[PDB]
């Protein structure tokens, strides 16, 4: 992916997260943890669901058409009938190929993007209270119990209350 998150600075996915598409693991004073992130998960799902429906219009009722298969040889006008159907089919085959490939590109690009946005969202709450460890984790330089971690997962972390403790511990 162009963001380099999935199969990038996040080394691998987690099989033990059956609870969502993206989430957190952590280690703190009350032990180790894991929690899915709903916001990001739904943001990605909502873009994937009904993707074709944005481009391919509703199946269209088609009735009497031309013959496409023939019992005897005729020549000129049968050549034209065949060539028209052959042309049609090659164009829709091309369209189908193109569509799936760029639609899949977009799926892969967008799911990597959500992984990146979640990392960036988390970095921005933490401010100078944490460091990027280079592997998709943050070292948080203060005591952070389960409620503290939850405030980060839920977008409510107030970094100012921990700021002084974080600075004390951060330079040794």
């Amino acid at each position: 992916g162009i963001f380099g998150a999935i199969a990038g600075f996040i080394e691998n996915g987690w099989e033990g997260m059956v609870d969502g598409w993206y989430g957190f693991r952590y280690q703190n004073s009350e032990g180790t943890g894991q929690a899915a992130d709903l916001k990001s998960t739904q943001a990605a799902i909502d873009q994937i669901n009904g993707k074709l429906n944005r481009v391919i219009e509703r199946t269209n009722e088609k009735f009497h058409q031309i013959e496409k298969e023939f019992s005897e040889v005729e020549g000129r006008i049968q050549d034209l009938e065949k060539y028209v159907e052959d042309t049609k089919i090659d164009l829709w085959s091309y369209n189908a190929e193109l569509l799936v490939a760029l639609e899949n590109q977009h799926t892969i690009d967008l799911t990597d993007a959500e992984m990146n946005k979640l990392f960036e969202k988390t970095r921005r709450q933490l401010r100078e209270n944490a460091e990027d460890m280079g592997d998709g984790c943050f070292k948080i330089y203060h005591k952070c119990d389960n409620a503290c971690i939850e405030s980060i997962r839920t977008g409510t972390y107030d970094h100012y209350v921990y700021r002084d403790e974080a600075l004390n511990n951060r330079f040794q």
């Binding site: 703190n28 994937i48 009497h64 892969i108 990597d112 979640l118 984790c137 005591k143 971690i149």
Partner: protein, 324 residues
């Protein structure tokens, strides 16, 4: 052993993975593994043609044209309408050997009309015998003819030049089927029509068609060396059908009602059965939840688009990255 985090904690981000993903293609890679994909091509037929939701008419032993002409073994279709008429390969004619110039066009026209219901009109044929018959066209055990055509012959020692009209004072186009008799020999020509050479001219204000018969032996089919050539005329509202003949006329008994129809005809040999579908193919009905389709290019209804490819996998999840 826990917990470690005295003045610190660590928070890692991640995403899920599944044990066994599936390969899709993108613009960037030929093959890349994703958690989940969905099939976009319908390659499986139902194996049968569904009786719902369209009105399907099984021709069984009849072509659409024979049913329209009124071949005896097709009398059960005489009051029938359809959205889709199924023609079986098994079909066969069992009346007087005939041909139709631009048969396909006529078949196409009737197919679109979606009906074979016929409206008799009071045509008057002075100086001729009506309702001619043939051992090549048995109705029950007695010999007969196409129910919608009227084989006119001499009365006594006379076949006068018929000139008959029929105005269209209705708000729709009338389709008339008619034809000519090609006798196998001149004995038969003069015995049936007196004149050594026949002719038929059907006209309107806007158009005309003249046909001359060719006397001579054709190969035997159903005991007959002669032939009937079938033609048609469309009379517009306010126009008038005119018919002129000194012999060899196979006359219409009335008209068919042409209507802008969403009906058609389809060649197929699969059985019809109890199920629901909105798309029909010579291989049977197919589901239409997918947008693409590799079963058959011949379709009717709400059908997925036909394409060359037999499978196309759409990713519905992220790239799958299991440990390691």
């Amino acid at each position: 052993q826990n917990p470690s985090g005295n003045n610190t904690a660590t928070l890692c981000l991640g995403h899920h993975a599944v044990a066994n993903g599936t390969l899709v293609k993108t613009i960037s890679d030929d093959q890349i593994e994703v958690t989940n994909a969905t099939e976009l091509v319908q390659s499986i037929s139902m194996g049968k043609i569904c009786n719902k939701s369209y009105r399907i008419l099984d021709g069984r032993n009849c072509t659409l044209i024979d049913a329209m002409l009124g071949d005896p073994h097709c009398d059960a279709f005489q009051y029938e309408s359809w959205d889709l008429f199924i023609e079986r390969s098994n079909a066969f004619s069992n009346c007087y050997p005939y041909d139709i110039p631009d048969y396909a066009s006529l078949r196409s026209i009737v197919a679109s009309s979606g009906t074979v219901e016929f409206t008799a009109e009071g045509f008057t044929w002075t100086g001729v015998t009506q309702n001619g018959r043939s051992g090549a066209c048995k109705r029950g055990s007695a010999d007969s003819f196409f129910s919608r055509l009227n084989w006119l012959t001499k009365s006594g020692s006379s076949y006068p030049t018929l000139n008959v009209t029929m105005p269209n004072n209705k708000n729709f186009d009338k389709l008339y089927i008619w034809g000519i008799h090609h006798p196998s020999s001149n004995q038969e020509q003069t015995k049936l029509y007196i004149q050594e050479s026949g002719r038929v001219t059907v006209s309107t204000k806007r158009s005309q068609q003249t046909i001359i018969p060719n006397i001579g032996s054709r190969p035997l089919v159903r005991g007959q060396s002669g032939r009937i050539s079938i033609y048609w005329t469309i009379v517009k509202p306010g126009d008038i059908l005119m018919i002129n003949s000194n012999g060899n006329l196979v006359a219409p008994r009335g008209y068919f009602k042409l209507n802008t129809g969403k009906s058609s005809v389809m060649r197929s040999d699969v059985p019809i059965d109890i199920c629901v579908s909105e798309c029909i193919t010579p291989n049977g009905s197919i589901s239409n939840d997918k947008p693409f389709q590799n079963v058959n290019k011949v379709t009717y209804g709400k059908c997925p688009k036909y394409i060359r490819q037999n499978t196309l996998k759409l990713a519905t999840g992220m790239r799958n990255v299991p440990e390691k």
